[PDB]
Structure formats: C-alpha cells, structure tokens
Amino acid sequence: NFEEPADAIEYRQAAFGLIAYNFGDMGAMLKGKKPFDAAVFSTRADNVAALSKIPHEGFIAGSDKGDTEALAKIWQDKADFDSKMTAFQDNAAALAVAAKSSDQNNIKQAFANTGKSCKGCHDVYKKD
C-alpha cells in the first residue's frame, strides 16, 4: 500500500513515536516520576495495545535505505522479527487487560514484559 519506501518508513516511525509517548507515561507512573492515576493509566495502556497493531505493516521488503533506523537484518531474519512483533502485541494487550483491574503487581509485571519487547527487538533490529 505504500507508494514509495519513504512512506512505509514514515508510517512505522510515526506509530512507534506514538507508542513511546504513551508507554513512557505509564513508565513515569510506575517509576514514581508522577503519581499513579488509574484512569489515565488505562487510557495509555489501551492506546499502546491499539497502536501496537500498526507498525508491522510498514516493514516492507528491503526498506532499509534512506532515513530509517531499521536494520537490513530485519529482512534476513524476518520470521524472528515477526515473532518478536507478535509477542509485543500480545504483551501490550495483556497490559491493557491488567490496567482494567486494581492489582498493581499484575500491572507492574505486564509493563515489564512489554518493555522487554522493546529492548529485545531494538537490540537486534534497530540502529544503535
């Protein structure tokens, strides 16, 4: 669906920026930079779960040229990248579910598992 590679790059970048902003606000609440607010937290978790469904589509074959932080490795090992992306989506969905209840230990664990998705994928598939 992308007319040029730049548009696929822009799409996936835009989605991850949105993900980072919303995910970071949950982080702030759990790290103690701001008080935990259950209502805002659940909006952020819902946002991350919905946004997680977006960027995969932008990783079109060979779009490692130009203004992208995606590595060529993505398309060398695309099944592994896809496995990570699916796990991330599933993690984000579990965080959204956890945010609908009061149990803080369950939220905190769900958040950690989702955060590990980010780091694990970036380590292998994103420029430093």
Does 12 contact ligand HEC by CB under 6 A?
yes
| Spatial separation of the C-alpha atoms in residues 13 and 68, rounded to whole Å | 8
Any contact of residue 51 with its own copies (CB under 8 A)?
Answer: yes
Nearer to ligand HEC, 41 or 125 (CB): 125
Strand partners, 126: 70
Q: What does the per-residue mask of binding to ligand HEC show for 103-122, with x meaning CB under 6 A?
A: -----------x--xx--xx
Q: Tell whether 69 is in a known binding site.
A: yes
For every residue of 65-108, DSSP letters joined together read SSS--B-THHHHSHHHHHHHHHHHHHHHHHHHHHTTSS-HHHHH
- The upper half-sphere exposure of residue 96, i.e. CA atoms within 13 Å in the direction of its Cβ, equals 17
* Smallest distance, ligand HEC to C-beta of residue 45, A: 11
Burial class (CB in 10 A: 0-12, 13-18, 19+), 70: buried
Task: Give the number of residues in contact with its own copies, rule: CB under 8 A.
Answer: 17
Torsion angles phi and psi, residue 99, rounded to 5: -65, -10
Nearer to its own copies, 18 or 118 (CB): 18
Cβ 74 vs Cβ 121: under 8 Å: no
Shortest Cβ distance from residue 76 to its own copies (Å)? Answer: 27
Query: Interface residues with ligand HEC (CB under 6 A)?
Result: 9, 12-13, 16-17, 19-20, 23, 68-70, 81, 84-85, 88, 114, 117-118, 121-122, 125-126
Query: Interface residues with its own copies (CB under 8 A)?
Result: 1, 10-11, 14-15, 17-18, 21, 24-25, 43, 46-47, 50-51, 53-54
